[PDB]
Design a protein around this ligand. Structure first.
Ligand SMILES: [Mn+2]
Ligand SMILES: [Mn+2]
Ligand SMILES: [Mn+2]
Ligand SMILES: [Zn+2]
Ligand SMILES: [Zn+2]
Length: 455
């Protein structure tokens, strides 16, 4: 009829044994879940992290949201307490349906959501909270600081405590010394009925994991990584405005779009209702979107496993082709890890070694190419010391680290080695190759990884 629900995504109910190590578990389910893009994880029944907060002392600045299909919204960006938001949220839903909120069936809210976003005559606006953990509003999980109860202490070091998972043994994102707070810290989300997250994939094609601490469910739609470009082609045809070049990371355009539209164009889509106490995990380059069924409170964080490393490299290549800004330098991350080879997990070391080999071979070829273009002069340069906005390629916006080209003619400007012709009109003999490492510096770094991997 008017909305046909996508098939359900995989749901996993790990034993305590399986659940004990999140990264082991995620690797285990990956062959299944990567075919659906998202999956849901129900922790063991007795894994129950305690949640406690004063609803009157937690306050936040609400974002306002129009609910129109295909309309452009910006991705990342009054004052409520948690109590006053809750009161607004419950009344909104109660008044919308002329029902008590627990009586409103989830399938009805879903059907109605897709009706109202598609109808021009309706102009429903809703509000929500989205912000990284701060002193005004912290994690929903226990954090060390305030005398904690024994039950809180039990969950302090859990891999599934989303504060840990970042610095947790296997997110290569942990090792990044660069400032990436917006991407590495957990985000807190206060939802209300119909408040929604537009179709998107994570920066650098990372994983994400979302925990619903309490409240009414969050409805999700997800698309497997292998269908990412199919989805973008559908979107581009129906809403080209979203695909124009953007001046920076703070201007990414995203939109609401009916999953049935994707399914009509043979893009595979899965759904789920995430309830309180459940996790949803999104996989690399898996498009996802959704909306809240009512007043709720969620927490989510990005992470990167060793499975992800090659995709991370591919993603930055993709950003270059699109002239998209990077959140961090992938090569910088790889070299930081190489410089710490002795303390790396051995499987991590082994996987980093493989990416590094590709990095070095690509870098070798690029340097040979720019030499043949007539760039002769060179000087070592510690790229990691420059603010990001001072080491982006003029042309493709990539964050430089391995090397770049400069010219005294254009002080402070840089191009990556793919865009030597785009820096200025001076002949290439006026240029300098700025490089972080010689090829001779690099091979021993990679050898340290091999030794650590015992290889
Ligand atoms: Mn509408
Ligand atoms: Mn997301
Ligand atoms: Mn180009
Ligand atoms: Zn470039
Ligand atoms: Zn010049």
């Amino acid at each position: 009829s008017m909305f046909l629900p996508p098939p359900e995504c995989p749901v996993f109910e790990p034993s305590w044994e399986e659940f004990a190590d999140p990264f082991a578990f995620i690797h285990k389910i990956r062959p299944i879940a990567e075919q659906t893009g998202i999956c849901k994880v129900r922790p063991p029944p007795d894994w129950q992290p305690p949640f406690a907060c004063d609803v009157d002392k937690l306050h936040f600045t609400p974002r306002i949201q129009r609910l129109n299909e295909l309309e452009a919204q910006t991705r990342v960006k009054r004052d409520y307490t948690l109590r006053t938001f809750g009161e607004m949220a419950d009344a909104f839903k109660s008044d919308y349906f002329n029902m008590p909120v627990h009586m409103v069936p989830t399938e009805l809210v879903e059907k109605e959501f897709w009706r109202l976003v598609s109808t021009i005559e309706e102009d429903v606006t809703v509000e929500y909270g989205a912000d990284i953990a701060s002193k005004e509003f912290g994690s929903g999980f226990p954090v060390r600081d305030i005398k904690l109860s024994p039950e809180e202490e039990e969950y302090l070091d859990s891999g599934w405590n989303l504060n840990n998972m970042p610095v947790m043994e296997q997110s290569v994102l942990a090792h990044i010394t660069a400032d990436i707070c917006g991407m590495k810290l957990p985000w807190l989300y206060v939802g209300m009925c119909f408040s929604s997250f537009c179709w998107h994939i994570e920066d650098h094609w990372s994983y994400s994991i979302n925990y619903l601490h309490w409240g009414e469910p969050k409805t999700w739609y997800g698309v497997p990584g292998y269908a990412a470009e199919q989805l973008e082609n559908v979107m581009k045809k129906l809403a080209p405005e979203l695909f124009v070049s953007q001046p920076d990371l703070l201007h990414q355009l995203v939109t609401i779009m009916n999953p049935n539209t994707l399914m009509t164009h043979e893009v595979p889509v899965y759904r789920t209702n995430q309830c309180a106490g459940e996790f949803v995990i999104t996989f690399p380059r898996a498009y996802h979107s959704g909306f809240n069924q009512g007043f709720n409170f969620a927490e989510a964080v990005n992470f990167c496993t060793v499975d992800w490393l090659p995709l991370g490299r591919q993603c930055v290549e993709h950003y270059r082709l699109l002239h998209r800004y990077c959140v961090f330098s992938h090569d910088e991350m790889i070299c930081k890890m190489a410089s710490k080879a002795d303390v790396l997990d051995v499987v991590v070391a082994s996987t980093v070694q493989k990416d590094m080999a590709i990095m070095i071979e690509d870098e070798k070829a690029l340097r040979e190419t720019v030499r043949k273009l007539g760039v002769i002069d060179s000087e070592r340069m510690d790229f990691e010391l420059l603010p990001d906005d001072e080491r982006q390629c003029v042309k493709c916006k990539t964050t430089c680290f391995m090397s770049a080209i400069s010219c005294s003619c254009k002080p402070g400007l840089l191009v990556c080695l793919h865009h030597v012709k785009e820096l200025c009109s001076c002949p290439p003999y006026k240029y300098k190759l700025r490089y972080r490492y010689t090829l001779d510096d690099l091979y021993p770094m990679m050898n340290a990884l091999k030794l650590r991997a015992e290889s």
